[PDB]
Design a protein around this ligand. Structure first.
Ligand code: ZLH
Length: 121
């Protein structure tokens, strides 16, 4: 109850579910800057799900809000890159975002409740 640390394993489980999703395929590893030579002209801060997982495992997120900001960057980097809707990878981005948001909602609410309970007195 009001466990301040519970978010970390809940985010590891949610990343496992995202790796199972066929829709994560394009987002599982950093973009090859040699394959996509212009990528860093458009994208200031590359992000992918393996980087998010390793940052979590390094103990380099202090809160699930920080992890949520990096996952949302994957989705906005994909939108910044799409030429049009006529792309399988843009279709996969929007479905995976909806799945992520549906599952992260309770992780954020529970964490923020726990900080409130810790400060209650
Ligand atoms: C650069 C794009 C979009 N993309 C990303 O934004 C991304 C984030 C993390 C890893 O990749 C996935 C790769 N992309 C492709 O077009 N590959 C498909 C090839 C036929 C062309």
């Amino acid at each position: 109850s009001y466990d301040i640390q519970a978010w970390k394993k809940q985010c590891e489980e949610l990343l496992n579910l995202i790796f199972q999703c066929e829709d994560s395929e394009p987002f599982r590893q950093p973009v090859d800057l040699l394959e996509y030579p212009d990528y860093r002209d458009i994208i200031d801060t590359p992000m992918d799900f393996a980087t998010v997982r390793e940052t979590l495992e390094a103990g380099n997120y202090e809160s699930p809000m920080e992890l949520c900001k990096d996952v949302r960057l994957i989705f906005s980097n994909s939108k910044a890159y799409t030429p049009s809707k006529r792309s399988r990878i843009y279709s996969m981005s929007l479905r995976l975002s909806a799945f992520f948001e549906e599952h992260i909602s309770s992780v954020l609410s529970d964490y923020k409740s726990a900080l409130r309970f810790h400060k209650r007195n």
